[PDB]
Amino acid sequence: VERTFLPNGNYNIKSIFSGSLYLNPVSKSLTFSNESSANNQKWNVEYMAENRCFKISNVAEPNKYLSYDNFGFISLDSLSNRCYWFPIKIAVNTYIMLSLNKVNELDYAWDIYDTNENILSQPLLLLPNFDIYNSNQMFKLEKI
């Protein structure tokens, strides 16, 4: 039963810089790659009522969740408090993804670096967030 603005289930994750690149793991990093039509570009989003946040696992690796390491990278890891994400919906299915926890006593969010709007081969990072206007922190969640 729905408890929030974003229903449970399987999503593709994209950056606003590109309609054709999809979030998937590559080695231990996360990056946006060409459509593979495979499970590793499918993400299971599940709401947690107790913390009013979301945990997001990879469909190909169902016991691995989006998390973050001690080096600023988004990672895929076993369940922990670093796997809790607090989205801010800013358009139809565009979200800023904050870590539930304050990091270095700031809001931190998913962040993808672009060079003239190109994000190829960039790893997804966790960087400070200050407002809802940072393009490098905007991500589409498409039910699919």
């Binding site: 600023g72 006593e105 700031l106 962040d111 670096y113 960087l127 400070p128 200050f130």
Partner: protein
């Protein structure tokens, strides 16, 4: 420990005409003013390996550049030695510019909004908006500065080239002529200055050492002549008074002959003694 206690100006690599400007707790970006409003003392803490950036404001003397966490805003606040008042000065070698990172959170660095004319914190990128030119305040004020130069024994008279073809240098009453104005330019390699007379394109003030103590204007197309370069040293507790010594022999100071004040009095070099006839006011032409 080489920038410690140095007084500097800080301007933007993105717009070199904009300087960090402080008044009443607010930091903005503003055109060059050549005064304390744009001056900052760098204060090194060896344990943190980071710097406080303290305003040389004359009314509030304890103000330092401060990150207003958790926002991205910057201001100046009373120095409490807090982590959000410390900054890492990272020199981008080959670019002669600095990235200035928060010591509290080095993910974040100063970013110049040249359109709002203020500063904020930002994550890094490859633009010039996060790069800053940090310069000794004397160099910053004097470099490319068009001035008149007066002995402090008579502030109504100035050092001049006689005219476009008479390259001699003497003392004369100020009459607003271009032969009475000099553009100071700093040479980074030589770490010294030249004085270009504005009546000529390439004529600089020069110690003619093959003729005793004489100084004259000569062409700056004499490439490696140290006699054409000068050190400009501020006199303590004044805003515009300097001694001026020659790069070829730094014991040699720009000197008003005998300390006479008459029109036509010779300007020369002479052994430095720091008397009043070897002190000069470098000023905006009115």
């Amino acid at each position: 420990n080489s920038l410690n206690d140095k007084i500097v100006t800080i301007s933007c690599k993105a717009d070199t005409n904009l300087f960090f400007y402080q008044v009443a707790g607010n930091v903005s970006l503003f055109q060059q003013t050549r005064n304390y409003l744009e001056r900052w003392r760098l204060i090194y803490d060896s344990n943190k390996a980071a710097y406080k950036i303290k305003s040389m404001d004359i009314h509030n003397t304890n103000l330092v550049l401060t990150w207003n966490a958790p926002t991205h805003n910057i201001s100046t606040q009373q120095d409490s030695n807090a982590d959000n008042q410390y900054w890492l000065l990272l020199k981008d070698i080959g670019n002669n510019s600095f990235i200035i990172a928060s010591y509290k959170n080095p993910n974040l660095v100063l970013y110049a909004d040249t359109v709002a004319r203020n500063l904020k914190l930002s994550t890094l990128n490859n633009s010039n908006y996060i790069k800053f030119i940090i310069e000794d305040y004397i160099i910053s004020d004097l470099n490319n500065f068009t001035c008149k130069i007066s002995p402090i024994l008579d502030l109504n008279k100035v050092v001049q080239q006689v005219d476009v073809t008479n390259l001699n240098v003497n003392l004369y009453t100020w009459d607003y002529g271009r032969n009475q104005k000099w553009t100071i330019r700093y040479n980074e390699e030589k770490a010294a200055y030249q004085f270009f007379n504005t009546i000529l394109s390439n004529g600089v003030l020069t110690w003619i050492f093959s003729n005793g103590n004489t100084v004259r204007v000569s062409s700056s197309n004499d490439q490696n002549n140290d006699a054409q370069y000068w050190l400009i040293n501020p006199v303590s507790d004044t805003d515009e008074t300097y001694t001026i010594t020659n790069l070829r022999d730094t014991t040699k100071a720009l000197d008003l002959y005998g300390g006479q004040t008459a029109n036509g009095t010779a300007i020369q070099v002479f052994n430095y003694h720091g008397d009043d006839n070897q002190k000069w006011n470098i000023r905006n032409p009115p």
